[PDB]
Amino acid sequence: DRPLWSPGSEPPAWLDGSLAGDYGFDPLHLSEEPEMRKWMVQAELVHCRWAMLGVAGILFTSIGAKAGGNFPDWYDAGKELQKNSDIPLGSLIFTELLLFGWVETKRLYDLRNPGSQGDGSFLGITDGLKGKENGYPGGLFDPMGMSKNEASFKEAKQKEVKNGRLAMLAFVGFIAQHHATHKSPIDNLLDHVADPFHVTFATNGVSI
Amino acid sequence: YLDGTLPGDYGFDPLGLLDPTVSNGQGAGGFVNPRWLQYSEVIHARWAMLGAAGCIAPEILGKAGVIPAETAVDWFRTGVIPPAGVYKDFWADPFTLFFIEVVAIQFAELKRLQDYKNPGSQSRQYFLGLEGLFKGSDNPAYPGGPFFNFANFGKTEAEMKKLKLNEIKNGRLAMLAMFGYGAQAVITGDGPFDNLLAHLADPTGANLIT
Amino acid sequence: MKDFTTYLSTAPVVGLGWAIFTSGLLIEINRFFPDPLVFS
Amino acid sequence: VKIAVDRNPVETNFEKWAKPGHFSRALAKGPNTTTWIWNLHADAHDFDNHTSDLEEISRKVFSAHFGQLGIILIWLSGMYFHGARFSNYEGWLSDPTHIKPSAQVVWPIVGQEILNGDVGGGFQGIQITSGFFQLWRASGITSELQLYSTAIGGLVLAAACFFAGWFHYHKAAPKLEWFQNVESMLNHHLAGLLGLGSLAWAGHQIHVSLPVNKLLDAGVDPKEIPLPHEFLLNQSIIADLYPSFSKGLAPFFTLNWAEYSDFLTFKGGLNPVTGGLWLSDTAHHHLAIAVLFLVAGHQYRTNWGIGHSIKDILESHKGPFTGNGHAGLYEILTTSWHAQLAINLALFGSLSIIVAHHMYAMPPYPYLATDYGTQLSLFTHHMWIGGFCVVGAGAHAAIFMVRDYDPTNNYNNLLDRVIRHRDAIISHLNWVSIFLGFHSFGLYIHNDTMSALGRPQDMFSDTAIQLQPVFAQWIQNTHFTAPQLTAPNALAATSLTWGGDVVAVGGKVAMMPIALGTSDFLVHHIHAFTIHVTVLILLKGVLFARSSRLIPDKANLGFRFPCDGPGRGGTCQVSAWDHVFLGLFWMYNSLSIVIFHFSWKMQSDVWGTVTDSGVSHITGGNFAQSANTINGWLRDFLWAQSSQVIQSYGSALSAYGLMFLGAHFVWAFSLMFLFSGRGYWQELIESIVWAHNKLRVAPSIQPRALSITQGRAVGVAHYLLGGIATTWSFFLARIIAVG
């Protein structure tokens, strides 16, 4: 009734097709149980949303570095920016770990108990901070009314995942074709566009 | 058990691999069975039918004046087995071409496998509008269709059986020929056509016995 | 998967995970903080 | 004859992983005592007890054997890998004599770095004694890149072997008919496996190993060596080394094989440079071996109406004194796996013993004879493996008599007639053991008593009442003077142990003639005493497994049972299992002295540093005088050679000093299980259960003392482990610190 990752393969029984970005891909029989499936869809989205947010940061800097702006490589950027910063390392970490423990913990107890954080305890907020679905909150994280329509919300969920899977593959690319060339991603792009037949992974001196 | 209904049946199975006794149960199971062995015979044949034609064509055309002699080179000195030789001037290095080879083939081959596991499965899913050409048939080796048999030759069944075995007799010969190309090259160290030119010249002097 | 998790809940598999924890904990506590004998 | 397979018999899922004990009817219920746990791990691989079907037993066996291959291949690939990345092979290859091998470097946590000794070659690690470095040099291996690829191949092939065990059991498993096609196995396993496998190795020897080791022995640096593929492609290169290659297979097909005399030789002896066999001789060996197994594989009948049939052979060799002979054995061996396992283990264990003798006298690999720790470790290893395998025959033959013995098929047969004069076998064999233990071991006590009384003239020794082994001495000379008369084309003898001159390598002797005297007479006869006795214990268990005069019905009790009862004066350790449990103690006492014989003899009479004036052996040649007395074995072997182990604290050999002690603990620890009994311990647990019950902390699985047979098994296991591990520490520390 729908496309699949390998045409002709019988899809699993537990992947009905309601989830966003479902192509019947689970040979290891993970997310076969309801509770684990309820956990993985939330793990996929955070691994996605962090990828989009991060990869865009790399393209913005690597483009600004190629244009002339003073931006370093995405690699060895935390080493050269900490040398000349008024904030020591350790005071910056546990400002991040301490501040995320608030959010990351509240998100957990909406998972274990939906609608639990909307009691009004946190600063008298009730209608917001209660989940619309598992990994898809609203009210406060959707200021624009771009989710009060199931017709336009179901396809947006498909675009959030498709541009996301693609995004966290790209981050694996940056890791790989940095270790080979030790250059920025954008520089590797302009080389391929300059002489596509000659500069590929075969001629980098690695992977052979 | 060899009734002779098949195209290329001439009663030669000394070891009895095609018997229906083996693989008695039902299921996917193993590869030794009539459904898979009949399929691989023509596949080894068609790939070999292409290879034996191509292994000797540049050399023949090179001896003739049509093709430049630079391109006309022995089939084992063109990039495969670089210790033998390697053609320097292509539009890309070999390994870049291998990734092109692996990708564009692994579409074609795995799509064929799913049609063996699930007939007609490739037409049901959208593939860029090319679904009508992959409907298949009862026998997976001879699918037919608007493309694979775009010029419908055997509208009659009897004419198909004649063609179905001419595909095999001309094909099983080619498989032997490629086995000769590999053996000739190792000993002689020269192309297959030059070896023919010697036997016609000095047959008693140029021979395996020598 | 329900049966796989059940196999992982058997005695020797859980004991293996315990052993890697207690052993790796003691070793890394001796990798750093080398040679303790008196406790400050 | 044909292929026969049953498709998708078993579904693959983890459902039974959660339910342990599914294979047995008794265990599938679940545990109410802790005895269920021990019976689980024990009856796991006893497929004959799970089900009566011979087909399922065959499917399980054929697929489990694929597992041992995968287990072996990752082990083998580990040695190649650990030899590539964590070793000094490239350094040892350039200076083999002075540098020692190492492939087990250690991590730096508490102490434990001192074990990384100053091995040499800009490297520090544990010193190995497995002889891989000499193996990798016998074949052409100069670089570490070849070892990496060899390791990746093993993991690839190992997963295929694991995959096949799943495929050929869970998906497409053969039928019982496919297994009973016995004549096709021998045809394929002789010609295909042993024949072509030996022929192929000759291809590697001829085309790769010979030229590489020719340049290495001529002083060429390994990095300057042409890579082994260059010898294949360039006929000109190898022709410079061996001019016969220029002719190119015309000598072979024209049947003029003398042209290949350059690299197919019958030199014999050893290489003067490496102290190992001529590599040219081995290529000739494995080549001729292939032609011999190839014809052997075309013997039987399989499908084409030519060949022999094993049944007609067996039921045609009949005699008067035997009656019906060899008749009902084809039905036995095609039906019971235990019968074959008994035969095969017997000849797979006696073979490793043959390997141990035929390597030390004929060192095949280069620079092995000069690595005394390696040469001593391979002998001790492949002998112990022979003793265990041989003892397994006595165990896995008694199971056949109990379980897979049908008297209907055997009437006036060879097997039936053996049982009918069993009391004559055990009786006549009992007399021999007593005759030997008196006339062999009593001679040692005579020498001890004569020495303590001040009568050394009356001892048995060279300066004394000599008992010389005339027969062995005659065989040494016959094999030494063979090249003159019986083997004219042989340039020299098979080994220098028979007679000749010394072969020195790196200032150390590889091999020199071994002289036999009065002491070697006593020891060779002491070994027969331990062997004829070890046979008495196992053979008695086999014949009396099914029935005896004391217990006319043992077969109904089974293979392993502790006792029938206290009656008849006592029936403890009457089963065939308990005969195996006793035979292991005698196998231990046997090979422990075969090993002491090898160490003291070779240290005193063979090994040592060659100087301008002869050779200076390690122990000054004290085997002749001291060995005749038992106190000599205590003084000159144990007290003396234990100095290197005891003084190992503070050096790289410190691990052997600890294993030397820990091996004694585990040995003595076994004595609690052998001497004691289940009764005392089950009562003690009751008084312990009271306290665990008083505090409301008690296990629902009731604690139960170990079964009787388990306490006996647990004893001999911790016993043999402590007895064997002590030698493993006493030897390697003694020999690595040479002398």
Ligand code: CLA
């Ligand atoms: C992941 C794939 C898979 C799955 C799901 C199954 C599932 C099953 N198999 Mg199968 N099998 C597989 C792979 C698999 N198999 C492979 C790869 C082989 C080839 C070896 C086999 C060979 C095989 C046989 C021959 C049999 C089964 C049987 C079974 C059933 C019982 C399983 C059981 O008791 O668990 C056991 C669970 C384990 C975890 C076993 C681990 C054993 C490992 C190999 C030992 C490791 C050695 C250790 C490291 C050495 C150190 C010890 C030291 C003291 C020396 C079940 C349907 C049995 C059956 O039909 O049921 C009656 C049966 O007789 N299987």
Ligand code: CLA
């Ligand atoms: C692969 C080979 C292998 C090996 C080496 C073992 C070894 C063992 N199994 Mg076992 N088992 C195997 C395969 C194997 N099993 C398979 C294939 C199955 C089927 C799924 C089982 C199912 C099974 C069950 C159901 C049970 C065992 C238990 C045991 C242990 C016996 C209890 C004991 O003496 O501790 C006595 C222990 C105490 C009195 C107090 C607790 C302290 C322990 C020693 C700490 C944990 C040890 C840890 C597991 C060691 C690491 C693993 C080790 C093998 C490397 C013993 C360690 C029993 C157990 O409880 O294991 C712990 C048990 O109930 N096994």
Ligand code: CLA
């Ligand atoms: C030339 C054919 C041939 C070859 C080479 C072998 C080889 C072998 N057989 Mg065998 N076998 C054959 C024909 C053959 N068989 C026939 C015709 C039958 C039926 C009549 C059997 C029935 C049979 C049984 C019942 C058993 C074997 C076993 C074995 C292995 C013994 C393990 C050993 O000694 O270590 C040597 C090990 C190696 C050299 C490692 C190589 C391992 C690779 C994977 C094997 C490659 C050869 C393979 C058979 C080729 C066909 C496979 C292909 C169809 C996929 C060995 C690999 C035993 C086994 O399976 O143990 C696992 C076993 O129990 N054989």
Ligand code: CLA
């Ligand atoms: C090809 C070799 C081979 C094979 C396939 C078998 C197969 C079998 N044997 Mg057999 N056996 C063999 C060799 C072999 N044996 C040899 C060489 C001997 C002489 C020692 C014996 C002596 C023997 C006896 C006396 C008995 C068997 C039994 C059995 C059956 C049950 C298996 C079992 O309980 O193990 C399941 C696995 C285990 C019990 C685990 C073994 C654990 C060992 C003891 C510890 C190893 C210690 C380790 C190496 C070193 C210490 C380190 C430690 C810290 C890890 C099975 C049919 C029994 C039976 O009922 O037969 C029908 C039986 O009573 N065998």
Ligand code: CLA
């Ligand atoms: C040092 C300890 C020791 C000794 C001396 C013996 C001795 C013997 N065991 Mg034995 N055994 C032992 C430990 C020992 N065992 C242990 C620990 C086990 C457990 C595994 C076994 C298990 C075992 C089995 C299972 C078997 C034996 C057998 C034998 C006998 C072999 C026949 C023989 O050669 O005797 C000849 C005599 C001697 C070896 C004695 C040596 C000392 C001298 C010669 C005696 C001198 C006598 C003196 C002059 C007279 C003085 C008289 C005085 C009153 C004035 C022999 C009596 C076998 C047996 O009895 O059947 C044949 C047998 O089957 N034993």
Ligand SMILES: CCCCCCCCCCCCCCCC(=O)OC[C@H](COP(=O)(O)OC[C@@H](O)CO)OC(=O)CCCCCCCCCCCCCCC
């Ligand atoms: C290693 C040396 C050991 C030798 C001493 C051992 C003696 C203990 C055996 C006594 C059993 C006697 C009853 C026989 C049993 C008997 O009655 O069977 C009868 C059998 C003759 O059988 P038939 O020809 O009637 O039938 C044979 C057919 O049944 C084939 O199955 O006799 C022999 O084979 C004689 C065997 C002599 C056995 C002694 C030699 C064994 C070692 C072989 C090497 C000897 C030469 C060595 C010199 C180099």
Ligand SMILES: CC(=C/C=C/C=C(C)/C=C/C=C(C)/C=C/[C@@]12O[C@]1(C)C[C@@H](O)CC2(C)C)/C=C/C=C(C)/C=C/[C@@]12O[C@]1(C)C[C@@H](O)CC2(C)C
């Ligand atoms: C002979 C053969 C060939 C395979 C034949 C199949 C082959 C050779 C594959 C061909 C593909 C090729 C040649 C393409 C190559 C190239 O791409 C490169 C690599 C290199 C470039 O230089 C050029 C180009 C051309 C581009 C088939 C052999 C099998 C035989 C004889 C079996 C015979 C029997 O007796 C038995 C055993 C068992 C009986 O129960 C059954 C039968 C059947 C009766």
Ligand code: SF4
């Ligand atoms: S338990 Fe002890 S006393 Fe009872 S029969 Fe067994 S060995 Fe004899």
